[PDB]
Amino acid sequence: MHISSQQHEKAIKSYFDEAQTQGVIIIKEGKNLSTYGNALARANKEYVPASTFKMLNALIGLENHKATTNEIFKWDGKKRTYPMWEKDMTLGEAMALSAVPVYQELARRTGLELMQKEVKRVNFGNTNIGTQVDNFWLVGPLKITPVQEVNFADDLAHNRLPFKLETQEEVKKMLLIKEVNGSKIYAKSGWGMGVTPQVGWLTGWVEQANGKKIPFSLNLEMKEGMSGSIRNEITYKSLENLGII
Numbered sequence: 202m203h204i205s206s207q208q209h210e211k212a213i214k215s216y217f218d219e220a221q222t223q224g225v226i227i228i229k230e231g232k233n234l235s236t237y238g239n240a241l242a243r244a245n246k247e248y249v250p251a252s253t254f255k256m257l258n259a260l261i262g263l264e265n266h267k268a269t270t271n272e273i274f275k276w277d278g279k280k281r282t283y284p285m286w287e288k289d290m291t292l293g294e295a296m297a298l299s300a301v302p303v304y305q306e307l308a309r310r311t312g313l314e315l316m317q318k319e320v321k322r323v324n325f326g327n328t329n330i331g332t333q334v335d336n337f338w339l340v341g342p343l344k345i346t347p348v349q350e351v352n353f354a355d356d357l358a359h360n361r362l363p364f365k366l367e368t369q370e371e372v373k374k375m376l377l378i379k380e381v382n383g384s385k386i387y388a389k390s391g392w393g394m395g396v397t398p399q400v401g402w403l404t405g406w407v408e409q410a411n412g413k414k415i416p417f418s419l420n421l422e423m424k425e426g427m428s429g430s431i432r433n434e435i436t437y438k439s440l441e442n443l444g445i446i
């Protein structure tokens with residue numbers, strides 16, 4: 202192409218600078234990792250996965266028959282942080298709304314012993330879930346780097362995780378968040394509010410019209426004041442700058 206790598210790096214860094222945060226976005230083309238943003242050293246640092254863990258929670262629950270894709274988890278009628286959570290939903294709907302109460306129910310059905318075994322089996326992050334089955338992805342001890350998240354997304358996009366093909370396909374259908382002139386973006390967002398500083402994620406992949414999958418993981422510091430949509434806006438501007446969408 203004609204745009205210098207200096208120009209691309211400067212543009213993407215500026216997206217993070219303009220949002221007044223510190224962050225990175227890692228892109229993988231084939232086996233090659235590229236790191237962009239205004240805080241590149243974040244790439245190999247560990248953070249809690251927060252709601253990004255719902256991807257793996259869903260795979261484990263479906264694989265081990267703790268839920269089906271059409272099962273409706275009923276709202277128990279207790280007040281929730283967000284009104285959109287106060288309703289009955291499938292795993293797929295709960296994935297789109299990041300409804301942690303539904304995924305806490307799923308984690309409790311899986312149980313600590315099986316959860317620890319499966320997280321170990323998948324080799325996810327530091328693989329440490331500790332003794333509380335319903336919050337380990339939110340406040341620790343489970344942590345993962347942006348590099349590990351992009352490689353997770355790569356494995357899921359390519360059906361390479363150690364679950365049935367059908368399990369992987371059912372979860373990937375839950376993750377479609379955007380369609381852009383023939384490209385589809387699959388991703389899960391994360392906003393870890395139970396740690397300091399607070400971490401923001403958007404981890405996923407672009408499926409281009411020709412079938413090629415380009416995984417990415419954005420990771421940044423969320424600060425009170427910020428809108429969740431900054432995660433998507435930075436990601437889309439970055440993939441667009443590089444010509445991926």
Ligand SMILES: *C(=O)[C@@H]([C@@H]1N=C(C(=O)O)[C@@H](S[C@@H]2CN[C@H](CNS(N)(=O)=O)C2)[C@@H]1C)[C@@H](C)O
Nearest residue numbers: 251252283284285286298299301390391392429
């Ligand atoms: C996951 O990381 C946390 C969860 N993820 C969120 C996200 O934005 O990534 C939020 S909740 C999400 C934003 N608002 C939607 C509901 N809308 S409404 N109109 O307010 O009912 C859902 C949240 C912090 C999770 C671990 O808590």
